Swiss-Prot record, chain B:
<feature type="binding site">
    <location>
        <position position="399"/>
    </location>
    <ligand>
        <name>heme b</name>
    </ligand>
</feature>
<feature type="binding site">
    <location>
        <position position="285"/>
    </location>
    <ligand>
        <name>L-arginine</name>
    </ligand>
</feature>
<feature type="binding site">
    <location>
        <position position="281"/>
    </location>
    <ligand>
        <name>L-arginine</name>
    </ligand>
</feature>
<protein>
    <recommendedName>
        <fullName>Nitric oxide synthase 1</fullName>
    </recommendedName>
</protein>
<feature type="binding site">
    <location>
        <position position="36"/>
    </location>
    <ligand>
        <name>(6R)-L-erythro-5,6,7,8-tetrahydrobiopterin</name>
    </ligand>
</feature>
<feature type="binding site">
    <location>
        <position position="171"/>
    </location>
    <ligand>
        <name>L-arginine</name>
    </ligand>
</feature>
<feature type="binding site">
    <location>
        <position position="371"/>
    </location>
    <ligand>
        <name>(6R)-L-erythro-5,6,7,8-tetrahydrobiopterin</name>
    </ligand>
</feature>
<feature type="binding site">
    <location>
        <position position="384"/>
    </location>
    <ligand>
        <name>(6R)-L-erythro-5,6,7,8-tetrahydrobiopterin</name>
    </ligand>
</feature>
<feature type="binding site" description="axial binding residue">
    <location>
        <position position="108"/>
    </location>
    <ligand>
        <name>heme b</name>
    </ligand>
</feature>
<comment type="similarity">
    <text>Belongs to the NOS family.</text>
</comment>
<feature type="binding site">
    <location>
        <position position="370"/>
    </location>
    <ligand>
        <name>(6R)-L-erythro-5,6,7,8-tetrahydrobiopterin</name>
    </ligand>
</feature>
<comment type="subunit">
    <text>Homodimer. Interacts with DLG4 (via N-terminal tandem pair of PDZ domains); the interaction possibly being prevented by the association between NOS1 and CAPON. Forms a ternary complex with CAPON and RASD1. Forms a ternary complex with CAPON and SYN1. Interacts with ZDHHC23. Interacts with NOSIP; which may impair its synaptic location. Interacts with HTR4. Interacts with SLC6A4. Interacts with VAC14.</text>
</comment>
<comment type="function">
    <text>Produces nitric oxide (NO) which is a messenger molecule with diverse functions throughout the body. In the brain and peripheral nervous system, NO displays many properties of a neurotransmitter. Inhibitory transmitter for non-adrenergic and non-cholinergic nerves in the colorectum. Probably has nitrosylase activity and mediates cysteine S-nitrosylation of cytoplasmic target proteins such SRR. Inhibitory transmitter for non-adrenergic and non-cholinergic nerves in the colorectum.</text>
</comment>
<feature type="binding site">
    <location>
        <position position="280"/>
    </location>
    <ligand>
        <name>L-arginine</name>
    </ligand>
</feature>
Amino acid sequence: RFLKVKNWETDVVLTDTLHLKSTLETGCTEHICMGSIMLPTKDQLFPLAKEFLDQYYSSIKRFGSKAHMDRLEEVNKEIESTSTYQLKDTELIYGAKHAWRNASRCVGRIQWSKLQVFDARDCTTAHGMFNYICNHVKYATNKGNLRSAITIFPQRTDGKHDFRVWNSQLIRYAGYKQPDGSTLGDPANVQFTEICIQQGWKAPRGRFDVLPLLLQANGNDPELFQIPPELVLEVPIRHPKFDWFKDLGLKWYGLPAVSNMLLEIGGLEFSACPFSGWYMGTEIGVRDYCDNSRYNILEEVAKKMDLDMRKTSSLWKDQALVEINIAVLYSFQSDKVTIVDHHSATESFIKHMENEYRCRGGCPADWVWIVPPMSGSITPVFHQEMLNYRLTPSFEYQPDPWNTHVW
Amino acid sequence: RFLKVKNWETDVVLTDTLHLKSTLETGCTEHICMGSIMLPVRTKDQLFPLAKEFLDQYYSSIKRFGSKAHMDRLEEVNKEIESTSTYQLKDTELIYGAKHAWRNASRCVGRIQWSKLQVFDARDCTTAHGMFNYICNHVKYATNKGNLRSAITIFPQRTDGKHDFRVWNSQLIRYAGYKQPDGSTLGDPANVQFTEICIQQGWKAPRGRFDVLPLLLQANGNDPELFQIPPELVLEVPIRHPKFDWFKDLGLKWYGLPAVSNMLLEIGGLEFSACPFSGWYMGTEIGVRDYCDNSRYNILEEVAKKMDLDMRKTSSLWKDQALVEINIAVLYSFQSDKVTIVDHHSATESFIKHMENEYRCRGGCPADWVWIVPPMSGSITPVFHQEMLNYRLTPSFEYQPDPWNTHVWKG
Ligand code: HEM
Ligand code: HEM
Ligand SMILES: CNCc1cc(C#N)cc(OCc2ccc3ccc(N)nc3c2)c1
Ligand SMILES: CNCc1cc(C#N)cc(OCc2ccc3ccc(N)nc3c2)c1
Ligand SMILES: C[C@H](O)[C@H](O)[C@H]1CNc2nc(N)[nH]c(=O)c2N1
Ligand SMILES: C[C@H](O)[C@H](O)[C@H]1CNc2nc(N)[nH]c(=O)c2N1
Ligand SMILES: [Zn+2]
């Protein structure tokens, strides 16, 4: 029950003990592996608090200390009285960094300890949320020299007073359904582009309209806000070889800022915790541009390359996919916006794995998500066995607000 | 219990009921997923229920469940077991068995073809020379002058585990690999260890970059013997590129017949330790893995160089670019020579259709996403977006230890 993992490219074997700390459940059994599935009170709360504080106080080398026991007592009393508890700033920052550290699907985790945590637990209104969010966006963007950040809004109370960012990311392009049949802009956000409009948003109906923020405070009706255009760093996409590439009329935003997840720390639930780092190239060029249910521009590109698009056997899609991804990187690098290629990021992750096994006893990792969506086996992670398990603190999926919101 | 899988590109949902028939274990638990881990003498005690489960399946398939033919067969197997401590499959059962082991192979993307398998019954074989003969005929039939035909040859089942039949090669056709004293490797690095064994057994190695390895064959638990496959039976394809004319000068070729020979076939508790099987290649097996894995021929750099690519920074995607051209070349050469091959877009698309058809008619299709998704261009193939359930059904193909690690030497 002390498990080993092998890298088949290098024969390096690591031994995992960290998994024995794990608490939550995978969805798998002895009889069935669900590794490729996308999604899996007072008495409940105190053991959850205890586990977290034990982790926290061990990490600062004061396990079994006055301070530790005192803090344990104080939280215990606050729970019994208030039916919840409040985290100290130091605990909050610790919890946030470890939620990222524990994200088994994140390839970018080597950077986990350098996260800028913004405490937004004093926020009361959507206008406040907006202000906190603009500050996040401007700080994280940093004129192209990106910095990882998370902004944490007040924690859940009774599920009727939830703070929520309705957007899936702070910055995303609209998608509008055309009468001619297809789809203009980003098909992923068609339902959301609608709700914004269904709420008052005047859509320029372009291919790349930055969506408004739809912010929800204390459980009230969400409100639209337009992010100041000068806070939205965008990169026009050109190819370092194909001069016709620019005419495609493509651009993307610099800041990937996921806003729909739930942060769990010591039993406490933060339903609104937008976080951001910087892009791996393939996220945009492979998935965003080339997924069928997204921008799906592959055909257009191959056409302009004049490739034999007659038989799949010519691998025109593969050839085009590469060039597109070359362009994304080139463009971002040219405009001095932080981006990482999949080779660099996966090599970084192997090292990070090494570090975590060495200093922590393991590193939970979801191979299905860690291996990039192109050129899989020529990246070192493909040949790396990984053990997937759920540690806490964590980022969790949560239901879409518009299915839950008691209007 | 019913389980649902979702294709996130088409929103198509399928319902699995077949996972209930699952017997073996996955390696996973409620607290840990081992989905990316590469690897996961029987007694009369535990043998009859395994026979029975298989015979129940077999007789259901032919719609004679509960028939007198069914009941008598069960009886016959039972007496034979408790009398002889094992049993013999009928030809019909053996053929069904082999096909279903392939059908159940969760890591195999080519399973649309499962019902079209040529089963060669080699259970009357007694010596390595006889093995060589059966294997020669397999290769000849399977190759069919480039028009490949799926086939499997099944040698006698295990008895006491002391008289095992084994093919010591990992595949029937594979290239030698030679560790040089300077640390560099000549030929296929994957085959270095096996190559050394062959040489030690008396193989006279030509020491080239593409030497077809001899067959090393063990019958009835005796020491293995060397055999050279007749070269006119080994179909090979020179690799060239449809636009790059220097590509031929790399000196590359590959063999046309992928024929895996080191797995164990399990049918109704019986273990067939020698059961070589073959289909035809998906292009990326050769082009991505065989040529471009760092631990294999590893030709990305030389190809990148001849392409004059920006090789100073990985963000130029010179590795990605070279990889695609090599795979174009592999596919081109095979089609040009009329040797059966399938590209990864075609194969994955076929798999989705197969999988849907299997859910509908069988109640499921066990699949290992980690292996099903191609090693290049993952998300632009439809399997990437397909949720899959992995579980182990029998009959099945299983890993087994390398024979040089377990073999008791006679001399
Ligand atoms: C700093 C550079 C970062 C890089 C290069 C990076 C990279 C990635 C990539 C490529 C994915 C797969 C995304 C997809 O396919 O949709 C991912 C997933 C994820 N990332 Fe990171 N990331 C970074 C920073 C962060 C930060 C700061 C956090 C949180 C504070 C984070 C948390 C996560 C989580 C929770 C997932 C999985 C979400 C899910 O389960 O769907 N990442 N990351
Ligand atoms: C006819 C054309 C076939 C194609 C195109 C095909 C395709 C593939 C591919 C690409 C793999 C992954 C191999 C790797 O990456 O190492 C695989 C795995 C596998 N195939 Fe098929 N296959 C075919 C026929 C067959 C046949 C005839 C059998 C047996 C009768 C079979 C049984 C298996 C098994 C057991 C695995 C898993 C190997 C493992 O677990 O290590 N396949 N297949
Ligand atoms: C449509 N994809 C599924 C998905 C769902 C959810 C949710 N809920 C979050 C997701 O987040 C992906 C993610 C998260 C954090 C990131 C940080 C940096 C970065 N470059 N990409 C990053 C990507 C993805
Ligand atoms: C070292 N690579 C991992 C591996 C291990 C073993 C074993 N034991 C078998 C393997 O078989 C892969 C396989 C099996 C059957 C195939 C049939 C056709 C085909 N084109 N490829 C096919 C590939 C692979
Ligand atoms: C560690 C990992 O499971 C291992 O490298 C696997 C990944 N997926 C694979 N998929 C296929 N088809 N063939 C392989 O050899 C592998 N290797
Ligand atoms: C079906 C499968 O679970 C789904 O397509 C997953 C596969 N792997 C992925 N990997 C990453 N990094 N991101 C994804 O969205 C997905 N999608
Ligand atoms: Zn699992």
